[PDB]
Design a protein around this ligand. Structure first.
Ligand SMILES: Cc1cc2nc3c(=O)[nH]c(=O)nc-3n(C[C@H](O)[C@H](O)[C@H](O)COP(=O)(O)OP(=O)(O)OC[C@H]3O[C@@H](n4cnc5c(N)ncnc54)[C@H](O)[C@@H]3O)c2cc1C
Ligand SMILES: Cc1cc2nc3c(=O)[nH]c(=O)nc-3n(C[C@H](O)[C@H](O)[C@H](O)COP(=O)(O)OP(=O)(O)OC[C@H]3O[C@@H](n4cnc5c(N)ncnc54)[C@H](O)[C@@H]3O)c2cc1C
Ligand SMILES: OC[C@@]1(O)OC[C@@H](O)[C@@H](O)[C@@H]1O
Ligand SMILES: OC[C@@]1(O)OC[C@@H](O)[C@@H](O)[C@@H]1O
Ligand SMILES: [K+]
Ligand SMILES: [K+]
Lengths: 449, 449
């Protein structure tokens, strides 16, 4: 039986980040990963998603905007297999980079599925391993609906396994994953349908953002089907699929992608023997320091039921190692005002409170909202003008900024610096005092009246 | 003879901004413009430049990156005339928007070239106009070298007048205009040569930015010719031009663009009768409140010899009107830490001090520099990988950020928010405390160690 100071179960965003930081402080570490290093983000998440998003931007440059910039083009072939091969080669380079990093930090990397034996012992590939400190960073996986024909659909992992350009696709879901996948497929030329259960996708985002996204989808696709609850999926004689909704509507497609949610990977590792508490949905419960209720067992990332983003898992994992192994007993991640980007068409950036949230929390008389609406300059010379809308939500007489929201070309890159300003307590006057950069979309955030 | 409370000479960035703000406070205003509303920026500057930059981005998406994303394309025709027509139509819409704004504010707009008669009187189109307050916001114009054959070259105004795609072009200069024009032409497919007098273009930018730009130019064009001082331009029998450099080198091209510098438009308006002081280069001298040495005469923008950017002219003009007409005697523009973007390939963003400047000012022991180097994700799956490099220049034990510099895809949109943070006095810890947005280029600014 092998013993380690620190063992991380799961070699994804949180596990790799935490184990490497612990190793830097001289701890004897092990990392157990059942599949590929980098977890969901590198293999079937943020990375391949972004590559596909870039492919869609190119397709749109060629088909939508290019003609009005003078480019008369012919796409002789769109080689999906080549795109996937290059995407895969990049991911392989990322794996190799992580392997080198872990090897250089002298972390023992074990390929296998870990199962607990007791609170401080796991078994993997028939070997028993003990550790004084165990991080459970097992992430999650896609969920699937329990309706007739659900098995004819694929999930986001399946989307990344597609080896040809789909002709007609139904995407079901109302979160960022559904929106992103539907936008990518629509941009590439697939006849794309997005099905949401209520009035819009991202329904709790600021109304400015939600309504602008609806406007764009209603002009450029994907075709949005609202108040659409899946009832069944029928496989037709020709191999096509018909999605039947509870309202009586039906749409026929070649592929159906379920993007209705995710669930935590906390059910197959014999967690019951550890005494670790989970909530009704299977998420591991943690305190502000990532401690479970069991001494020496911690959890970070998607398996904990909170802000399911890579940088959150990474930062929580690193700060945990700082706390445990670098004599910083109070070190922890601040989960307030974390910025989010959705790689929709066009992209969305958001931080903090929406206008309705701020009004509910502070009262109408304490809230002041500033907004801007303009046409993206990239699209302005074309027949496909696209809006860009931005909002600052302010509280108090000093107009402290408590929310920043934008939708439009460039929002993906615009938000980060504004997140720093908001973390520092920026007020509207701080924005007023900064000179604009022209011509950009970002300058609109510092020019509102 | 008409009398006004406030008269602005020049209907460009500064004049329009200032006159509209004064009109908002009930002043009787006039604006005199000799050419087109919007000045240099709208007509032959920031606006058409950005449209052309977007055209080059599309060309690069098609020719450079697209193939590795699976796009086998054929450009049947690149219709330069169509691009110019759409660019021009957009500019026309901007003119119409400014006209409506000025008409709604009841500003008298006069199309003509104003010449002073005395310190408070001008003549335009044979009409005499007096005003209690006169803003001189006349901007500048391109400079031309005094060498044999200089007349065969065109300047940046001439670049916007091109009505066909040039095949071979020499761009001469080392500032942002030369870099931008050369990058656009190179991206569109013109055989492009850039000639700088010393080691590099943008020679005083941070060395990390300068050397990365050289690296990219040396891989993807334009062809950079350094220590290159123009001697003469020869027109050959076939109509081509040969640029002879003093070092004995030469390059034959179809068109030559001088982008060496600009000069102020302060020489043809009979300024001598006003007593207004100018420096040896013709720039109008102003105090922190945009006052000239003559009571009731002010100047803002490019004619004053400072930060020649549109938002600076705009902000100075608006603040001047606040001061003069809205009872804010101390209102003025803060010219420190103004952010700049250069629309090079790839774009550059910079604020504050370079590393050498900070070391010289504060001493080596007080400066700490953080840097990041990575490959732009857009280019990572292709055979044309492009670097992205970033730097934070910090001073003191608290590591106050005094300079922020980056070069890479997205820098154009990334910088603004970081400018707000720097204006608020951000330190490295403030960046450390902000959670990253993944996957973006911007996150690298908050993840440096
Ligand atoms: C389609 C999609 C797009 C996304 N886009 C973004 C984005 O743009 N930006 C962003 O910030 N986030 C994005 N995310 C979220 C991001 O991927 C996750 O938040 C992040 O991967 C969570 O990290 P983690 O360490 O909690 O889990 P993971 O990275 O999922 O890692 C968990 C690892 O544990 C392994 N494992 C599980 N059980 C065991 C066991 N018993 N033994 C050994 N190994 C085990 C798994 O194989 C896996 O590799 C996206 C997710 C998806 C699905
Ligand atoms: C190629 C190029 C690219 C640029 N790109 C950018 C950029 O990306 N970002 C940025 O911030 N800045 C950019 N600039 C700079 C920007 O254009 C200027 O800083 C800005 O236009 C200066 O504003 P202004 O009001 O001082 O002068 P201008 O906008 O030049 O306006 C002066 C006006 O006065 C008129 N005029 C002059 N004399 C008289 C007279 N006697 N009577 C009546 N009218 C008169 C002129 O016709 C002109 O319209 C660029 C400039 C160029 C040349
Ligand atoms: O791709 C299959 C899978 O099991 O791989 C490990 C994790 O990324 C899971 O989310 C994912 O469903
Ligand atoms: O286009 C010609 C010109 O005279 O128009 C007015 C200003 O924009 C000048 O800079 C410019 O040279
Ligand atoms: K501002
Ligand atoms: K950070």
């Amino acid at each position: 039986t092998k013993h380690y100071d620190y063992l991380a179960i799961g070699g994804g965003s949180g596990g790799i980040a935490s184990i490497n930081r612990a190793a830097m402080y001289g701890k004897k570490c092990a990392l157990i990963e059942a599949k590929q290093l980098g977890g969901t983000c590198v293999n079937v998440g943020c990375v391949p998603k972004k590559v596909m998003w870039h492919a869609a931007q190119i397709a749109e440059a060629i088909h939508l905007y290019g003609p009005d910039y003078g480019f008369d083009t012919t796409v002789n072939h769109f080689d999906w297999k080549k795109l996937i091969a290059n995407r895969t080669a990049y991911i392989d380079r990322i794996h190799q980079s992580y392997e080198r990093g872990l090897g250089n930090n002298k972390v023992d990397v074990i390929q296998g599925f870990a199962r607990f034996v007791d609170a401080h012992t796991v078994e993997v590939n028939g070997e028993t391993i003990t550790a004084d400190h165990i991080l459970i960073a097992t992430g999650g996986r896609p969920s699937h609906p329990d309706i007739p024909g659900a098995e004819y659909g694929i999930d986001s992992d399946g989307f990344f396994e597609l080896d040809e350009m789909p002709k007609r696709v139904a995407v079901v879901g109302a979160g960022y994953i559904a929106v992103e996948i539907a936008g990518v497929l629509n941009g590439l030329g697939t006849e794309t349908h997005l099905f949401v259960r209520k009035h819009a996708p991202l329904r709790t985002f600021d109304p400015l953002i939600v309504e602008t996204l609806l406007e764009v989808m209603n002009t450029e696709g994907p075709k949005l089907h609202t108040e659409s609850v899946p009832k069944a999926v029928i496989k037709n004689a020709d191999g096509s699929l018909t999605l039947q909704l509870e309202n009586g509507t039906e749409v026929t497609v070649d592929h159906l992608i379920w993007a209705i949610g995710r669930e935590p990977a906390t059910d197959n590792l014999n967690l019951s023997v550890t005494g670790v508490k989970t909530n009704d949905k299977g998420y591991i419960e943690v305190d502000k320091f990532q401690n479970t209720n069991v001494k020496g067992i911690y959890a970070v990332g998607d398996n904990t039921g909170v802000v399911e983003l890579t940088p959150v898992a990474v930062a929580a994992g690193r700060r945990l190692s700082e706390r445990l192994f670098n004599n910083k007993p109070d070190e922890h991640l601040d989960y307030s005002n974390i910025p989010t980007v959705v790689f929709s068409h066009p992209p969305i950036g958001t931080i903090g409170l929406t206008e309705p949230q701020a009004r509910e929390k502070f009262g109408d008389d304490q809230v002041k909202v500033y907004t801007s609406s303009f046409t993206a300059m990239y699209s302005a010379v074309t027949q496909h003008r696209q809006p860009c809308r931005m909002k600052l939500v302010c509280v108090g007489a000093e107009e402290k900024i408590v929310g920043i929201h934008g939708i439009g070309f460039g929002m993906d890159e615009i938000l980060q610096g504004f997140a720093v300003a908001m973390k520092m307590g920026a007020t509207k006057k701080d924005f007023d005092n900064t000179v604009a950069i022209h011509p950009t979309a970002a300058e609109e955030f510092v020019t509102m009246r």
